A paper describes a structure:
eIF2B is an ~500 kDa decamer, assembled from two sets of five subunits (Kashiwagi et al., 2016). It has two catalytic sites, each comprised of the bipartite ε-subunit whose two domains embrace the nucleotide-binding eIF2γ enforcing a conformation that favors GDP dissociation and exchange with GTP. Engagement of unphosphorylated eIF2 in this catalytically productive conformation depends on binding of the NTD of the eIF2 α-subunit (eIF2α-NTD) in a pocket between the β- and δ-subunits of eIF2B, ~100 Å from the catalytic site (Kashiwagi et al., 2019; Kenner et al., 2019). When eIF2 is phosphorylated, the phosphorylated eIF2α-NTD (P-eIF2α-NTD) engages eIF2B at an alternative site, between the α- and δ-subunits of eIF2B (Adomavicius et al., 2019; Gordiyenko et al., 2019; Kashiwagi et al., 2019; Kenner et al., 2019): a catalytically nonproductive binding mode that inhibits eIF2B’s nucleotide exchange activity (Kashiwagi et al., 2019).
Simultaneous binding of eIF2(αP) to both regulatory sites deforms the ISRIB-binding pocket. It is plausible that the rigid, largely helical structure of eIF2B’s regulatory pocket (comprised of the helical NTDs of its α-, β-, and δ-subunits) (Kuhle et al., 2015) contributes to this allosteric coupling, rendering the concurrent binding of ISRIB with two molecules of eIF2(αP) unlikely. ISRIB is expected to be especially antagonistic toward engagement of a second eIF2(αP) trimer, hence discouraging eIF2B from assuming its most inhibited conformation.
Numbering used by the authors:
A (entry chain F): 1 to 11, 28 to 134, 155 to 238, 258 to 295, 342 to 444
B (entry chain C): 8 to 98, 126 to 351
C (entry chain D): 177 to 351
D (entry chain I): 41 to 467
E (entry chain G): 166 to 518
Write the structure that this text describes.
Amino acid sequence: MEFQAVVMAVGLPVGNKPLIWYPLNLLERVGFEEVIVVTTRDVQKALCAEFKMKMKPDIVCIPDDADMGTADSLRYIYPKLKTDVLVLSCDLITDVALHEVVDLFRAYDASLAMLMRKRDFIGVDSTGKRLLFMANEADLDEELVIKGSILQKHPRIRFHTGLVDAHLYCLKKYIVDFLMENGSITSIRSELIPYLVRKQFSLKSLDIYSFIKEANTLNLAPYDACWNACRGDRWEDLSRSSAQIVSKHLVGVDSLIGPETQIGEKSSIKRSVIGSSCLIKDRVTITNCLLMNSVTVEEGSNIQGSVICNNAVIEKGADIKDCLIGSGQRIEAKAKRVNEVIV
Amino acid sequence: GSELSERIESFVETLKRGGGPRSSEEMARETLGLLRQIITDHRWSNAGELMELIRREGRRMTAAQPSETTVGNMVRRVLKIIREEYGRLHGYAQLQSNIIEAINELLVELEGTMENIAAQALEHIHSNEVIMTIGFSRTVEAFLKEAARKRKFHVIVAECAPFCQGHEMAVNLSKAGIETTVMTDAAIFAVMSRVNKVIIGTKTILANGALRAVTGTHTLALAAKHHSTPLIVCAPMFKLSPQFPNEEDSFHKFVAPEEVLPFTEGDILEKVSVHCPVFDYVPPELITLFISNIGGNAPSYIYRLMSELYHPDDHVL
Amino acid sequence: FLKEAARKRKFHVIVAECAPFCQGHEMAVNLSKAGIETTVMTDAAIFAVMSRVNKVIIGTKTILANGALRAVTGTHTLALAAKHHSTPLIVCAPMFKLSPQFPNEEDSFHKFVAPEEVLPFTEGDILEKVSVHCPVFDYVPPELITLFISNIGGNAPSYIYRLMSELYHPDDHVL
Amino acid sequence: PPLQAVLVADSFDRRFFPISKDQPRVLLPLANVALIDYTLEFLTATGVQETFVFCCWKAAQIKEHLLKSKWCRPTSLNVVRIITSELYRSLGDVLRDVDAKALVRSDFLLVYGDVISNINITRALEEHRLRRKLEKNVSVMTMIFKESSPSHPTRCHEDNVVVAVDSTTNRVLHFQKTQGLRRFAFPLSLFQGSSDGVEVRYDLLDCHISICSPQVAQLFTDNFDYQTRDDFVRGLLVNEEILGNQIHMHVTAKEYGARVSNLHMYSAVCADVIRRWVYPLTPEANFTDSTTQSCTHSRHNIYRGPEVSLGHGSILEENVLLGSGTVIGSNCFITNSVIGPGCHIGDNVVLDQTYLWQGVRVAAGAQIHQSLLCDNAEVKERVTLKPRSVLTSQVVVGPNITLPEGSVISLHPPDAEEDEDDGEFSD
Amino acid sequence: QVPTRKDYGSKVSLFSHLPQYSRQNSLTQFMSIPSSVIHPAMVRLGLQYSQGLVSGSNARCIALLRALQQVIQDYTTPPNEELSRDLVNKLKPYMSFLTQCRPLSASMHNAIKFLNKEITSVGSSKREEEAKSELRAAIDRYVQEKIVLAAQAISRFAYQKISNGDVILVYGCSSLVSRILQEAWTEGRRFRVVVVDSRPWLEGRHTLRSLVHAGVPASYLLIPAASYVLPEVSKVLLGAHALLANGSVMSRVGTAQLALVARAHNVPVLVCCETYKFCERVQTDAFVSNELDDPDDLQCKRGEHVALANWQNHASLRLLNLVYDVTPPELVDLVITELGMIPCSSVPVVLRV
């Protein structure tokens, strides 16, 4: 092929399904038969197989060493790559019309197409595509030193300060080659883009295009945004509890839990995103939050606004609200503080 | 007394720049109001003194914006009427009231010329037809949505480029179920082979039928001389003028060059001597058939009408 | 031509009829036998209807070395009309209707047929001083036609004097 | 309510020298029509009935021309009050006067001495009064700017302005000139002050026709440092902490609004008023009522006053004007120029993009390009000039004397780059 | 597997059979982006045809042929197959898709036809790579000789018929007239162009710029006022985005009308056209084949309001704007092709034999 199903992300498979599946079925839905993957990198070289449990039987992937920057990882993966590249992130849950991104990339032959869905203040073209001067707040001291040229070129620069990026960049192969030649940068999102957009001015021009959006965003260890993104995708991801035995007995309120859906009563939860492999059918109160899989409930647990993690057996009338009862804390008769409980 | 001068100056000013009165009917109407005001609220022993006075004021009113002669020919007709009344009362006492009643006759006729044209319409159009106009005149839109409530033709209006003025008509007439098609003026000839007749307005009908219309019509008159499809010139009788075509060609109305080449263009405006006329002259021989509140006529009857209304001496105004 | 290019569309075919002896009438019957909206008319009012006509397809008898074909009578006045209304003249003649003589080569370029069809003998005495002409072939000039539909495609009155040299010889003009 | 409008009859960076010593910058006949008339006509048309012309530099002549002119006659729908005061020489003084003398009810236009324009501010004025009464006097000055493109020959290096405006409210979030600057500077917390999106902007020609509330003179007289509207808006836009009262703006599409500040922009706006860019303002309308200016507009913009009597076989390319009573020489060649009323011309003389004025006289043989010739600039034979080769006030040039580019010559030894003469020497 | 761009509102009476497309639903929304069906070079070409970035005849043909080079010299052959069969079979859907995304001008049609003949030339005589590089060299020699050398010879010709002291007139982004006027100004030959232009795709700006950036003292004025300039336009030098059998010069919608007013005003005409725009078909009216674009661009920002914002909600408002009309050969007083200064009536023979 001429396009590339590459991905890029560091630091994971939490949520409804593994955090990796969503971009995978995204891509395999928007063409992209083959799917290139860059797997576990944190400390180990073995979670590749644990990532190989996706329903799609197509996967090509590599594991790597401890620390690798995004620019470093790309210069690293340079060998097995041969054409136009499309870097993505496992940390982006969106149902975007990406075809429009590669559209604005191909039509104008701009060297690089980026997407930005409503730090991260950019200055873009008078007509909404050709970005001109991007940065974050802590980048430059207090001013906007806009090179007199680019205002001599588009005397109406329209800005976007209240806006977050997405980190999905279509890069022409030659900029990949030149990047590989250069061994100073480490981060795409930080120093790749501004480098191009600053060298855009000073025939061949290294045009670069940006696409504004209001659909969906990215998420990291603060998956707070991810829980509500999955709230939307529970309206989406069934065609874009949910797919399991459906009992409709207890309080299933915009909720979704996988198989092993414990059929019990006296339990409730609102605005919920529940997980599977759980012995939670007995009496419990509301949750009003989301939670990973493999949980339990018994004796009227009054949980609230937190994450019920994996591989736990918690029950017996608890009192918690806005406190992470996550990896490595599980009791029954306990009232938890309302602050940031590190667990 | 000074109220005279103040409404005179208001009229002259809103003439030099003021958009609106829109329909030339309305321009002539407020002109006639001002004429009545002048011709009742001033002093004159003989009638010739009023001839001279109104001649002065009409000379100023026309040399203000000579691109518009509805006011000029109104002045000339009023001078004809004073000639009439002086002749009647010579071969002085109360002729003022006679003037005013004749002017009221003129004005009530003016107020109905549009319906005269409307009633005369349907004798020229019939179904399974396609008609082409240009620009926008209130007379033509009255004409068409008048003939529309009896039968449904297919009008093809060509939007003028310096102003998408025809556009408005194409909306207005679309509000009678009339099959309006909007084409870009350039493409006139591209469809000139399927337009059974054209209906063009004017802003003047010079003294030999050589009308002067909205720009983008000399091309229409020539593309309809070519295919020998006919020009229905829907010109209400009051739009004439005893002036003749070849006169110093300060004849069009050179509107601001921002219509064609916007100012935001850039440096190239150094030596690009842009132009923009909104009045295309049209010669007589291309003009097939005049309409008027009297009936139908030929471009040769226009000289009869000019010797009819405007006394041939006051062409210099 | 028409009854093949009209089994897709439906449109206006104003068949004039040759007045000497009605010729377009079986034409009209044959067309109407497929329903083509055929309107038959006497050849004397063409300049009346010409201004509501779009394409003027005329069937010709033979062409010349100017393009100035000569065809069934009344086609020259139809050509003067259909130029006065600047419609095209879409002739439809195959190749073999093309002869490399020139317009004013034949004394009586036309073909006068028996005047009995213009003023039949049953008239009487007035047949003693009436030169009843009947030229049943009339001569289209060159500059009134625009588009030959030959069976090689479209052509123009100035891609004919080469169809000669492509088909005939120079010195076979006199045969 | 009415709309008064102040005409500050002299901006106070005296640049037209020695031009500003024979007749003021406002008495400058742009096209045989004193700039003051274009300003007053703009006022009368845009809706003004109330003007005050505060004239400072030799105000007596501005009066003597103005009083016998149109608006000062009672038949005017626009009242003019020549508030003459040779006391001060700063625009802030005019604003402080119209503050202390209580000479505004509300919404008084502020126009400089020579703005050339035909803008209909009725939409600007309506939005002004609206956002005023709909947001309770928070606004101060609603600016109006002409869309342009950064290289049109009007906006040169002198006053290339830069704005940072909002999107909807159209308020000037930031402002600065760019005469001798190649970068730009702003606060990031300002863009925090507009999270919906600030918009830098550079394609705005400055019309100098910002509408002034009474709170303009209010917030002005409180300080003394403010001495030019630029300083005013710089102050209003640096005091964004304590009652900044955002200066408001509004961009226009069609009409042409510029200001003859300097000889370069003067020539630009002359050869752009000739070219009908400001219809109705175009000398055939003769909005300045005088029959000594009947421009019988001809083909190819070849204007022609009454009783012209030009030469023999002399192509007049285009954009030419010819004042009244002139006379042209045989086989001359005018282009893009402007001539003055009753000004002779000699045989075999080319005049490209020049600007002669009243009284001038050029005998045979000369060749002038891009220059200017102020009043009565009699000229001998066989003389050439260069771009911007101004002169002024009767300085006869000797024959065979070519002049370089900035050849400013007039009576003044230490200001004009030569002295008055009938050769090229002998001060 | 090749979708279609649906119609847009309502057509005109005569044009219910002509196409009318929309400038928004470029098929690149519903084609799998790693286009294993269409070579992404071909898709990029189609797309940037849609938006109207590349417009003129020469420019569109250059783009088509560069895309064909880019795909051919990277084509891959299947075994047990003949090149001049498997190639054209693998290619036909690409031309279909290009037609879909935008109609094919005359120049592009003749380029496709030339390439079809050239592909039929090669065969198993050479192995894949040989005939492939051969095809590439052939397309490049075409791009040289048929347009570049064409413009050169046409400029050398028309340099005879431009007199020092006259004016000329043009119409829109016709590349040949730009080149002719430029090169005719470099040789010390003075004139004074007066461009004209039409709406919506106001394009006379192109030649106006390209002239003044080269020192040509031009002037600009919209086409409905052109009938005012002709008292001085001592020639007329039109482009020709096509040529037809009967001398019917098919061009942009203004050329025919302009030539008519020129004839009636008594000033010469001179179309300019190279020698592959002669398509082997004939057309006598402006309706059997034209292209209605995305029509929603007629609306003007006149005054304060777009006069047709609700273009389609009216039950009976229907907007046409043709792209080409067909000026007839009674008016075309020259055709300066590189084969000679042939008058237009004698074009059905010269360019054909």
